[PDB]
Amino acid sequence: VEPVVVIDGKGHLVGRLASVVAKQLLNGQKIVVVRAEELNISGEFFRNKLKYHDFLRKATAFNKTRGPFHFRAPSRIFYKALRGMVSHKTARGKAALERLKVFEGIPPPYDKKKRVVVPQALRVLRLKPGRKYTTLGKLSTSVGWKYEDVVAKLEAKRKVSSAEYYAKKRAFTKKVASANATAAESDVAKQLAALGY
Amino acid sequence: AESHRLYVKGKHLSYQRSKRVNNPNVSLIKIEGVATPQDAQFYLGKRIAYVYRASKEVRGSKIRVMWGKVTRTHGNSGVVRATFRNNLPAKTFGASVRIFLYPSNI
Amino acid sequence: MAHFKEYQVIGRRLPTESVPEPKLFRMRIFASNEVIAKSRYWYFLQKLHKVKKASGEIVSINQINEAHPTKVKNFGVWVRYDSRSGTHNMYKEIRDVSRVAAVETLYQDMAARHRARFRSIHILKVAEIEKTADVKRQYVKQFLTKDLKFPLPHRVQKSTKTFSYKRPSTFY
Amino acid sequence: SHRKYEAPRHGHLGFLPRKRAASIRARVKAFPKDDRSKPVALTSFLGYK
Amino acid sequence: ASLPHPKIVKKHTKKFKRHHSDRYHRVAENWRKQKGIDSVVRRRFRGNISQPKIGYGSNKKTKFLSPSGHKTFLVANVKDLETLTMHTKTYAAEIAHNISAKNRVVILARAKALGIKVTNPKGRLAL
RNA sequence: GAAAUUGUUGAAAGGGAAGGGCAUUUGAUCAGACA
RNA sequence: AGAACUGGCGAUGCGGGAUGAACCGAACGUAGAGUUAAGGUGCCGGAAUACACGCUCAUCAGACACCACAAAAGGUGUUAG
RNA sequence: GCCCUGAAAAUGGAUGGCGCUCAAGCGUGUUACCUAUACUCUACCGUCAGGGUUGAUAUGAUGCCCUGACGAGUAGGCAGGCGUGGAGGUCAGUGACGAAGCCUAGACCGUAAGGUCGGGUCGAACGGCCUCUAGUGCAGAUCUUGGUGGUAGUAGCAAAUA
RNA sequence: UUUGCUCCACACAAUAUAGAUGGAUACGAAUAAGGCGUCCUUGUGGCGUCGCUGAACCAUAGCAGGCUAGCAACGGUGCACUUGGCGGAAAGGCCUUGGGUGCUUGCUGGCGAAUUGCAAUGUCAUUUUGCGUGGGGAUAAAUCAUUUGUAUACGACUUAGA
Ligand SMILES: [Mg+2]
Ligand SMILES: [Mg+2]
Ligand SMILES: [Mg+2]
Ligand SMILES: [Mg+2]
Ligand SMILES: [Mg+2]
Ligand SMILES: [Mg+2]
Ligand SMILES: [Mg+2]
Ligand SMILES: [Mg+2]
Ligand SMILES: [Mg+2]
Ligand SMILES: [Mg+2]
Ligand SMILES: [Mg+2]
Ligand SMILES: [Mg+2]
Ligand SMILES: [Mg+2]
Ligand SMILES: [Mg+2]
Ligand SMILES: [Mg+2]
Ligand SMILES: [Mg+2]
Ligand SMILES: [Mg+2]
Ligand SMILES: [Mg+2]
Ligand SMILES: [Mg+2]
Ligand SMILES: [Mg+2]
Ligand SMILES: [Mg+2]
Ligand SMILES: [Mg+2]
Ligand SMILES: [Mg+2]
Ligand SMILES: [Mg+2]
Ligand SMILES: [Mg+2]
Ligand SMILES: [Mg+2]
Ligand SMILES: [Mg+2]
Ligand SMILES: [Mg+2]
Ligand SMILES: [Mg+2]
Ligand SMILES: [Mg+2]
Ligand SMILES: [Mg+2]
Ligand SMILES: [Mg+2]
Ligand SMILES: [Mg+2]
Ligand SMILES: [Mg+2]
Ligand SMILES: [Mg+2]
Ligand SMILES: [Mg+2]
Ligand SMILES: [Mg+2]
Ligand SMILES: [Mg+2]
Ligand SMILES: [Mg+2]
Ligand SMILES: [Mg+2]
Ligand SMILES: [Mg+2]
Ligand SMILES: [Mg+2]
Ligand SMILES: [Mg+2]
Ligand SMILES: [Mg+2]
Ligand SMILES: [Mg+2]
Ligand SMILES: [Mg+2]
Ligand SMILES: [Mg+2]
Ligand SMILES: [Mg+2]
Ligand SMILES: [Mg+2]
Ligand SMILES: [Mg+2]
Ligand SMILES: [Mg+2]
Ligand SMILES: [Mg+2]
Ligand SMILES: [Mg+2]
């Protein structure tokens, strides 16, 4: 559909986000995921915290290096979720993952690019209301991620600039709408209404 | 104009396959904007070019094409089966593909 | 077991020399087809009389159609059921628009609340609760209150594309 | 089977790997927490033993 | 200019090499049937090499035909070559490998006159 | 004057063996048939 | 460890049960098209993030025969009787 | 009923993995969809079977033509074939204008054993067909003899004063 | 060591390509609530309106888009220049000024197109490198050996030498 699809992580469920992101790749669709710290996981924080520590104990007994590596950043928690959904040891596998990029927050390029959402993974469309759920940022920082506060800082800054952008935009579209309204009633206008426009 | 496309965009997905055995003789094709087996019945028999490039010029071009036709629909979500003159290279799982509008029936 | 029809099944004790014209007994039977329905008939008849299909004959099989298929009715349902550790008698009330509908969701309910597969259930009576205030079970009384109105909070629309450009809204 | 008698291990694993350092000039991995009320000054120095 | 024939369909053009001939020098590629008790090949486990069997046998209509249409016939001298005089659309002469050069030229020479096809008309040709 | 095994030259491939099966891309190489 | 009847494995690949002598499906000449079995259809992975009614929230939830275990006894958690 | 307590073991770890909570969980219903060497239809090979056809004046009567069914396989039986050394017959066979042998991700025939050819190398003999004959076919036997590797420029070449 | 390097320009050539073929089209936050317009007492404020999918929006006609003329508008847009300003999370991009210049399918005209033969991707992208030319710019170091001992099995480390 588009050369690159940027997904806003916020309010999405890890494994459902992972499940669709994987399939997109394998089908040739480049993807970037953003705001991965604002990802969700079903189940209360304490559960997904313990679940994390189970992952946390698996290591190669003779050499903790060669054994399973534990990444603590929300992007990378997410990448784990994904890579497991991709035959990542085949060439075709490596191929699809290279089409993928995950980020905390929304760094340059992508922050002036539009981001989409993935309804079949949107927490607010999916979790029965009332069920407890978890935010990645909160989980990650509880397992050692260093950069929650900075990401918060930078975003809040980003988040200021973009409200400027928007408000400025909202004001111009008002002009445009005004402009459109004189054109209303004109011949060409009534004609286009006939043709569904 | 700026658009010249007389085909529909398509994606080379898998070969026909089980869990553990594939069939290089049938390719599976994802056609843009076809969501249902009914939608896909329109495309049955349309012809499909996979176009690709190469180093050696040949009949004067560095562009080559594998050709084939769509043949039946596949499962419930608009995907399509298709066979080619020579089977498709399998590195192409994920590559684009062109589906044409002939042989037409409108 | 499926999507039910309801049948009158009539049968009788193969005639004899000394006893021609045997007594004739009927059952209503809830079943998906007339094949299952005759089976079921013989299943219960050998639980009540001395017959078995071998020595008996089906006389008539007819589908009973719902009297007023678009009138909301309050059904009380009596059932017999087998649990893991012993067998049990029950009463539920189900509100729907046909007895056939009703038996569809009984069977569902037994299966889901008591884990009772279709083999382990016996419908005892299904009968329309005529006058309200004989309606016993509160999960039905609930729906009988005057000028009833209720909203459906937190709307989920089903997406058709994988991607969306909006952020949804569960307003309604 | 099991040690038979218990004794602590031998040496501290927080000092692995026990390899030669990347440089003769060991690195400051940490500076004091900044109290920006005080006057500007250095927070370390260089010398020779 | 060979007799007409149906499309010549080969059925399995890949050589049937011996199992493990690719594994130890001491094992020639020549076919050879495993008789092992445990053997995967003999047991036909998915994954391994197929073995020759009579399913593959070629169409009675095109067997022995080589690409052109002609069955080939080994030829040593002119007498031999002449045995194909009423058979030009059916047989091609192959000149035997130990025929001399000065004799190959007589044989081509005649096969020309007789309109008989020769399959290796370049052997020893003193160019 | 074979083979194991070696030197050199040329071509190619190689993220914890290699080799194998079905299939096709790409390179190299080649038969037949046209008339 | 030892008998009865049948069906198997041994002597046998193929599809399924991740895996596996014996389970489930199905028994093999070379191939094309079709349809299926057992088993599956979020992603790995071909195939509905299908439809429907309930149930269940576990600070060690649960998740499909053979099979890769759990019991008595308890709960003012919740559900229907 | 589901869930929870009852519920303790040794490298880190397994509903197959990821992960899933109005499920991607449990019970039950309804459809659709995926795909086995199996089922249906077709071609081709072979096996078994049943028919037909000695009429000359051309080429296989163990042949030719029609038709139908069938095809797993260890130990094992039988059959039809492939290849070697030597023997009788024959082709008045090949050959110093190059026999035999050897090399060749060159060609062709055979389902296969194998056969055939080109090119290179070479130097004196050799082959097709019908038959006869056997000291007649190797991957194994801690097989026999001979030759050769990785190990590896490695262990080492440090006793007896210099 | 035979005129080498670099940034820009075009030129020839090679070599590629996980897969151009109108546009990745920018608040935030909530979802048992929100967007937008408008008013005002500027608020957890009044009033109005919208959703129920991007099925949108934008673009889109012209030899793959030729050669030309005119009108109406004074708008749109490409391009190289110039004015001011912003962006460090990976800013490496965004906005503003001003003249120049091309196009305009906003409307109305003149001319061209065939024979590529009834389809054959019918070749219009961007990767990296190599070689000359001439428009700017730039004129090192590391290693061996020697040497120290803050080091060392050998490499390595650390000093020193116009
Ligand atoms: Mg009635
Ligand atoms: Mg101890
Ligand atoms: Mg170092
Ligand atoms: Mg053998
Ligand atoms: Mg063995
Ligand atoms: Mg065995
Ligand atoms: Mg010599
Ligand atoms: Mg191949
Ligand atoms: Mg045995
Ligand atoms: Mg078997
Ligand atoms: Mg299997
Ligand atoms: Mg299992
Ligand atoms: Mg059974
Ligand atoms: Mg996987
Ligand atoms: Mg799939
Ligand atoms: Mg469906
Ligand atoms: Mg059981
Ligand atoms: Mg209990
Ligand atoms: Mg209870
Ligand atoms: Mg479990
Ligand atoms: Mg699973
Ligand atoms: Mg279910
Ligand atoms: Mg078959
Ligand atoms: Mg057999
Ligand atoms: Mg013989
Ligand atoms: Mg002999
Ligand atoms: Mg002898
Ligand atoms: Mg060789
Ligand atoms: Mg040849
Ligand atoms: Mg020669
Ligand atoms: Mg020779
Ligand atoms: Mg001599
Ligand atoms: Mg003989
Ligand atoms: Mg012997
Ligand atoms: Mg052998
Ligand atoms: Mg040997
Ligand atoms: Mg050996
Ligand atoms: Mg042996
Ligand atoms: Mg030996
Ligand atoms: Mg030496
Ligand atoms: Mg030494
Ligand atoms: Mg010594
Ligand atoms: Mg010494
Ligand atoms: Mg000494
Ligand atoms: Mg590539
Ligand atoms: Mg409002
Ligand atoms: Mg407002
Ligand atoms: Mg308001
Ligand atoms: Mg819009
Ligand atoms: Mg134009
Ligand atoms: Mg980036
Ligand atoms: Mg014009
Ligand atoms: Mg220069």
How far is the CA of E111 from the CAs of C32, C132, E4, in angstroms?
84, 112, 21
CA distance C23 to C16: 12
Strand B63-74 to strand B79-84: parallel, antiparallel, or no bridges (unpaired)? antiparallel
User: Chain B residues within 8 A (CB-CB) of chain A?
Assistant: 11, 13, 30, 32, 91, 93-96
Structure tokens at B43: 């495309």
Chains touching chain E, criterion 3+ CB pairs below 8 Å? none
Strand C73-82 to strand C25-31: parallel, antiparallel, or no bridges (unpaired)? unpaired
DSSP string, chain C: --S-EEEEEEE-----SSS-S---EEEEEEESSHHHHHHHHHHHHTTTSS--GGG--EEEEEEPPPSSTTS-EEEEEEEEEE-SSSEEEEEEEEEESSHHHHHHHHHHHHHHHS---GGGEEEEEEEE--SSS----HHHHGGG-TT------S--PPPSSS-BSS------
Burial class (CB in 10 A: 0-12, 13-18, 19+), B72: middle
Strand A31-34 to strand A5-8: parallel, antiparallel, or no bridges (unpaired)? parallel
E107 Cβ contact list (under 8 Å, min separation 6): E75, E77, E78, E81, E93, E95, E99, E118
CA distance E81 to D31: 101
Nearest by Cα to A17 from A138, A126, A146, A130:
A126
Please say whether the beta carbons of A108 and A70 come within 8 A: no
Burial class (CB in 10 A: 0-12, 13-18, 19+), B100: middle
Burial class (CB in 10 A: 0-12, 13-18, 19+), E104: buried
**Chain A residues whose beta carbon lies within 8 Å of the beta carbon of residue C165:** 114, 116-117
Helix (H, G, I), strand (E, B) or coil at D32: coil
Q: Which CATH number fits domain C3-69: 3.40.190.10, 1.10.760.10, 3.10.20.10, 3.40.50.1100?
A: 3.10.20.10
State the CATH class of domain C70-146. Answer: alpha beta
How far is the CA of C64 from the CAs of C4, C29, C121, in angstroms?
11, 10, 21
Whether the CB of B46 is less than 7 Å away from nucleic strand G comes out as: no
Q: Which residue of C has its CA nearest to A19?
A: C162
Nearest by Cα to C95 from C140, C148, C144, C145:
C140
Please say whether the beta carbons of B27 and B87 come within 8 A: yes
Please say whether the beta carbons of A97 and A86 come within 8 A: yes
How far is the CA of E85 from the CAs of E90, E110, E114, E119, in angstroms?
10, 11, 7, 16
Element housing A186 (H / E)? none
Q: Do domains C3-69 and C70-146 have the same CATH topology?
A: yes
Q: Which residue is nearest to nucleotide H71 (CA to C1')?
A: E55
Contact criterion met (CB < 8 Å) for C164 and A116: yes
Element housing A147 (H / E)? none
Strand B22-31 to strand B8-17: parallel, antiparallel, or no bridges (unpaired)? antiparallel
Q: Which residue of B has its CA nearest to A25?
A: B94
Please say whether the beta carbons of E92 and E3 come within 8 A: no
* Torsion angle of C-alpha atoms A63, A66, A72, A74, degrees rounded to 10: -170
Please say whether the beta carbons of E88 and E115 come within 8 A: yes
Q: Phi then psi for C107, rounded to 5 degrees?
A: -55, -40
B45 Cβ contact list (under 8 Å, min separation 6): B69, B70, B71, B103
Name the packing angle between helices A14-26 and A74-83 (round to 10°).
60
Name the packing angle between helices A91-98 and A14-26 (round to 10°).
110
- C-beta atoms surrounding E69 within 10 Å: 17
Give the nucleotide at minimum CA-to-C1' distance from E19: F20
- Convert A168-185 to b/e letters by CB count within 10 Å (16 or more is b): eeeeeeeeeeeeeeeeee
How far is the CA of A166 from the CAs of A162, A171, A172, in angstroms?
6, 8, 10
The dihedral through the CA atoms of E60, E64, E66, E72 has a sign that is negative
How distant is the alpha carbon of residue A107 from its chain centre?
13
Domain spans of chain C?
3-69, 70-146
E73 Cβ contact list (under 8 Å, min separation 6): E83, E84, E91, E92, E93, E94
Burial class (CB in 10 A: 0-12, 13-18, 19+), C41: buried
Please say whether the beta carbons of B7 and B101 come within 8 A: yes
CA distance E3 to E69: 7
* Torsion angle of C-alpha atoms C95, C99, C101, C104, degrees rounded to 10: 100
DSSP string, C135-159: ---HHHHGGG-TT------S--PPP
Nearest by Cα to A7 from A119, A135, A117:
A117
- The residue with tokens 């709307």 is C155
Helix (H, G, I), strand (E, B) or coil at A20: helix
Scanning B7-101, the segments in alpha helix (DSSP H) are 37-41
* Torsion angle of C-alpha atoms A158, A163, A164, A170, degrees rounded to 10: 150
- C-beta atoms surrounding E55 within 10 Å: 7
Length, in residues, of chain A: 197
Scanning chain E, the segments in alpha helix (DSSP H) are 40-43, 78-81, 101-113
Please say whether the beta carbons of A104 and A147 come within 8 A: yes
Structure tokens at A53: 């520590």
Q: How many CA atoms lie within 13 A of B14 on its CB side?
A: 11
Strand B47-53 to strand B63-74: parallel, antiparallel, or no bridges (unpaired)? antiparallel
Give the nucleotide at minimum CA-to-C1' distance from A94: I18
Chosen from A4, A8, A19, A120 to mutate, greatest number of chain C CBs within 10 A: A120
User: Chain C residues within 8 A (CB-CB) of chain A?
Assistant: 154, 156, 159, 162-168, 170
Contact criterion met (CB < 8 Å) for A28 and B11: yes
Helix (H, G, I), strand (E, B) or coil at A154: helix
Q: Phi then psi for B69, rounded to 5 degrees?
A: -125, 155
CA distance A152 to A150: 5
Whether the CB of B89 is less than 7 Å away from nucleic strand I comes out as: yes
Please say whether the beta carbons of B93 and B104 come within 8 A: no
Strand E117-118 to strand E71-75: parallel, antiparallel, or no bridges (unpaired)? unpaired
| Residues in chain B preceding a C-to-N separation beyond 2.5 angstroms (breaks) | none
Chains touching chain C, criterion 3+ CB pairs below 8 Å? A
